[PDB]
Amino acid sequence: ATQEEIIAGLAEIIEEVTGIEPSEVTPEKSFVDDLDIDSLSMVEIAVQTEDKYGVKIPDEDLAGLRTVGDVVAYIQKL
Amino acid sequence: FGKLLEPKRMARVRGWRKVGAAIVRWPGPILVGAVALALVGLLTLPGYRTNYNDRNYLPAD
Amino acid sequence: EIHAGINTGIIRAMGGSGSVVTAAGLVFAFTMMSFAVSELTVMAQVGTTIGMGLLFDTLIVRSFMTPSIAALLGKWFWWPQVVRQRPIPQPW
User: Fold this and answer.
1) What span, in angstroms and rounded, lies between the C-alpha atoms of A49 and C19?
2) Domain limits, chain A
3) Helix (H, G, I), strand (E, B) or coil at A67
4) Which of A34, A38, A59, A70 is labelled catalytic?
């Protein structure tokens, strides 16, 4: 499915960025409550996604997404 | 020979990646802020006087 | 580190090398700044000038200004070479 492949690509990104294993990165938990993420780490995720897997997430919209399911849904709706 | 040079703790690389991404996302405002501090440094420069007397650069004993 | 995107190159080279250059600058700068307690005034002046200049160069120029200019000029930073802003977008 497209959803699981996008989750796999994002999980590879989050593995490279903040050192969190892909096994328990699931779309059923949030970023800042469970993975202990920062605001600037969202910028890291955004920039790495822009270069590696070309798709545009603008400014002032990283804060709109809170869970991994929200981010993968945001990617697949484009 | 032994177990001497090994990396302990991972906290500086993550922070410097964070400030690098901060630079990348907003290259406009960070440049104008940095050059603003640069101008604050530079406006003092044209008023500058030297002293060729070393008598005032030594103790008095 | 250009080939996998230009500005991911900036973040990756920053995390790889800014730490090392800032560590070297900070050690040398504080070693030069400890000269300020000398009773010889001119040596204290030279040490304080070099130390304060190296804090300014390390902390606000090389850490904030130069990567900002590199990220603002973009692919025109490497002229006459023909570099690409992003790689070909790989599939999922």
Assistant:
1) 24
2) 1-78
3) strand
4) A38
